[PDB]
């Protein structure tokens, strides 16, 4: 009935799943009411106001726990599910192929994957295109280590990984292909981000961006009101922005759009659902893995509760109206 009340009950496994889902669904429904305007005139005013506001602006989970929660390549982004029996591992790969098709990857190209995570796309491209030089860029020591280790086991010679904050990283190097998957959501300054990317491109390069979106409006991932315990739980900072499907159309100072797609949010929902189910299946192993690094069974339960609530929440968000509210947007660009 209040902030701490719900949080207390949540950490103590006293909120059932059906209730938790229902609570979170309500929260997102209120986000919808906040975002939809009665006329397109007003909707544009709202969206443009947000776009204009944009132009003014240490602990790492064990990889072993990650393997117990995510799919094989530990994709930390929306996958693509062909069939109702598609496993998370298949969906991972489907998603990878889609990106390769849409980014127009060809054997022989230099490829840069900014915010490359545990490197599932770096690894996919490298294995499928033996003549591409694939660079991952990441700000995490542990991710760089995991990718390099996987490249070694897979007998891959065409992989390097830059350890850098992209917002600080400087280089003369250019690339045939730049891929940005689930990373723009974290970018403080998009206009300046897009500008940097353009400098790492030539007249021949293509830029492919994928981000979670709403079809109609943008929002920060944060509490609207006092009843929203979820937003602040999941993103304790709240430097996750959710751009509208079309927000990036407004950021063509330095790049030019060539194509634009969205993927229905049921794919994302099935992604988080799989992560959740798999986490549940491996609940005990997960606790054992985390206990060393956390040194407290309560600290572990804390870290697990949060990852699970994220999945449970993500499921309500992306499945809303059969995936026709929150979904994933994709764009292809060339340099000016």
Ligand X SMILES: C[S@@+](CC[C@H](N)C(=O)[O-])C[C@H]1O[C@@H](n2cnc3c(N)ncnc32)[C@H](O)[C@@H]1O
Ligand Y SMILES: COc1ccc(C[C@@H]2c3cc(O)c(OC)cc3CCN2C)cc1O
Catalytic (active-site) positions: 311
- In the chain, count H helices and then E strands: 12, 9
Q: Residue 183, interface with ligand X (CB under 6 A)?
A: yes
The interface region with ligand X, picked from 59-67, 124-132, 181-189, 298-306 by CB under 6 A, is 181-189
Contact 274, 88 (CB under 8 A): yes
Instruction: Please give the structure tokens belonging to residue 30.
Output: 């209120």
Expressed in angstroms, the distance from the first to the final Cα of the chain is: 53
Q: Residue 271, interface with ligand X (CB under 6 A)?
A: no
Strands (E), 166-302: 175-181, 201-214, 219-220, 241-244, 255-263
Q: Residue 186, interface with ligand X (CB under 6 A)?
A: yes
Instruction: Please give the structure tokens belonging to residue 42.
Output: 């007003």
Q: Which is nearer to ligand X, 10 or 78 (CB)?
A: 78
As measured in angstroms, the least distance from the Cβ of 35 to ligand X is 22
- CA 165 to chain centroid: 17
Member of 103, 132, 166, 197 binding ligand X (CB under 6 A)? 166
Query: Which entry of ligand Y, ligand X, none binds 138, CB below 5 to 8 A by partner kind?
Result: ligand X
Nearest to 206 by CA among 171, 258, 134: 258
As measured in angstroms, the least distance from the Cβ of 42 to ligand X is 32
Instruction: Please give the structure tokens belonging to residue 3.
Output: 């902030």
> How far, in Å, are 66, 71, 302, 314, 328 from residue 278 at the CA level?
11, 9, 18, 15, 23
| Residues between 73 and 102 that touch ligand Y (CB under 6 A) | 76-77
As measured in angstroms, the least distance from the Cβ of 22 to ligand X is 27
Query: Which entry of ligand X, ligand Y, none binds 272, CB below 5 to 8 A by partner kind?
Result: ligand Y
Query: Which entry of ligand X, ligand Y, none binds 313, CB below 5 to 8 A by partner kind?
Result: none
Residue count, binding to ligand X (CB under 6 A): 18
Query: Which entry of ligand X, ligand Y, none binds 212, CB below 5 to 8 A by partner kind?
Result: ligand Y
Q: Residue 272, interface with ligand Y (CB under 6 A)?
A: yes
> How far, in Å, are 167, 187, 325 from residue 190 at the CA level?
10, 6, 23
Taking the C-alpha atoms of residue 222 and residue 238, their distance in angstroms, rounded to an integer, is: 6
Q: Residue 137, interface with ligand Y (CB under 6 A)?
A: no
Query: Which entry of ligand X, ligand Y, none binds 166, CB below 5 to 8 A by partner kind?
Result: ligand X
Residue count, binding to ligand Y (CB under 6 A): 7
Q: Which is nearer to ligand X, 149 or 291 (CB)?
A: 149
Site string for ligand Y, 171-200 (x = CB under 6 A): ---------------x--------------
Element (H, E) at 312: helix 297-323
Query: Which entry of ligand X, ligand Y, none binds 314, CB below 5 to 8 A by partner kind?
Result: ligand Y
Q: Residue 196, interface with ligand X (CB under 6 A)?
A: no
CA atoms within 13 A of residue 305's CA, in its CB half-sphere? 19
211: number of Cβ within 10 Å: 24
Specify the 3-state DSSP secondary structure of 230.
helix
Q: Which is nearer to ligand Y, 139 or 301 (CB)?
A: 139
As measured in angstroms, the least distance from the Cβ of 117 to ligand Y is 8
Contact 320, 326 (CB under 8 A): yes
- CA pseudo-torsion sign 92, 97, 102, 105: positive
248: number of Cβ within 10 Å: 23
Where is the binding site for S-adenosyl-L-homocysteine, in residues?
76-77, 139, 143, 165-166
Site residues for ligand X per CB under 6 A: 75-77, 115-117, 137-140, 143, 165-167, 181-183, 186
Where is the binding site, in residues?
76-77, 139, 143, 165-166
Site residues for ligand Y per CB under 6 A: 76-77, 186, 212, 268, 272, 314
């Amino acid at each position: 009935e209040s902030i701490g009340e719900i949080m207390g009950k949540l950490m103590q496994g006293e909120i059932g799943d059906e209730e938790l889902s229902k609570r979170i669904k309500e929260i997102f429904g209120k986000r919808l009411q906040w975002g939809y305007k009665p006329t397109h005139q007003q909707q544009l005013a709202f969206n443009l106001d947000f776009i204009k506001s944009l132009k003014e602006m240490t602990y790492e989970l064990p990889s072993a726990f990650l393997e117990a929660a995510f799919g094989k390549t530990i994709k930390q982004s929306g996958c693509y599910f062909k069939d109702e029996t598609t496993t998370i591992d298949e969906a991972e790969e489907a998603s990878h192929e889609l990106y390769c098709e849409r980014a127009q990857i060809k054997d022989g190209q230099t490829v840069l994957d900014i915010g490359c995570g545990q490197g599932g796309l770096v690894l996919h491209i490298a294995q499928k295109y033996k003549n591409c030089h694939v660079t991952g860029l990441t700000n995490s020591k542990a991710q760089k280590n995991y990718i390099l280790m996987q490249a070694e086991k897979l007998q891959l010679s065409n992989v390097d990984v830059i350890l850098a904050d992209v917002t600080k990283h400087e280089s003369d190097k250019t690339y045939d292909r730049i891929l940005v998957i689930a990373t723009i959501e974290h970018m403080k300054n998009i206009q300046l981000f897009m500008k940097k990317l353009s400098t790492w491109m030539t007249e021949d390069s293509l830029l492919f961006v994928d981000h979670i979106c709403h079809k109609t409006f943008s929002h920060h991932f944060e509490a609207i009101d006092e009843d929203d315990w979820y937003s602040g739980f999941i993103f304790p900072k709240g430097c996750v922005t959710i751009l509208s499907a079309s927000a990036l159309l407004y950021f063509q100072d330095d790049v030019t759009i060539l194509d634009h797609w969205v993927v229905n949010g049921m794919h994302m929902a099935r992604s988080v659902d799989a992560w959740r189910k798999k986490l549940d299946k491996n609940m005990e192993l997960a606790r054992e893995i985390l206990l060393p690094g956390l040194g407290s069974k309560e600290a572990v339960n804390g870290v697990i509760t949060h990852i699970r609530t994220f999945c449970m929440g993500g499921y309500e968000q992306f499945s809303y109206n059969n995936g026709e509210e929150w979904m994933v947007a994709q764009m292809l660009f060339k340099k000016k």
